[PDB]
Design a protein around this ligand. Structure first.
Ligand SMILES: [K+]
Ligand SMILES: [K+]
Lengths: 83, 83
């Protein structure tokens, strides 16, 4: 599984809008509007790296309200070499 | 209760050592080794902001392996209207 924590800057006044639009997506497990250097921190989980890159490409990158991002990934695979 | 995510830059090779020392702390609820702008992400809950401030500037300094932190205070999250 791949977990991504994405820090985001949004357009002014669109923080909650972005938070809820993201939470309506199945891949988004948690989301927080925050006070700090960024406006939100969002937790995403996908089965594969391919799934995460597709999620970012079709969802995140096509939401004009999201203006800046910083992505962090944790890959948790207990059998990465089991093929 | 205050909820926050502390993003950390750590010296290389000390992530898990620090992660385990962090997870053992009562304030620390979740910790993840990650790849990206930061090396470690930790979710903390404290009674007050003053407590969070002391954790960030005093407790974290007990681990010099942690070189930089940026903290995001949650002001809205996924339990809004959903609790
Ligand atoms: K969701
Ligand atoms: K703990």
């Amino acid at each position: 599984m791949v977990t991504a924590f994405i820090l985001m800057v949004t357009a002014a006044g669109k923080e909650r809008e972005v938070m809820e639009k993201l939470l309506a997506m199945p891949e988004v497990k948690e989301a927080y509007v925050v006070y700090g250097e960024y406006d939100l921190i969002v937790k995403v989980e996908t089965d594969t790296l391919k799934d995460l890159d597709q999620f970012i490409t079709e969802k995140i990158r096509k939401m004009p309200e999201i203006q800046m991002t910083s992505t962090m990934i944790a890959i948790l695979e207990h059998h990465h070499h089991h093929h």
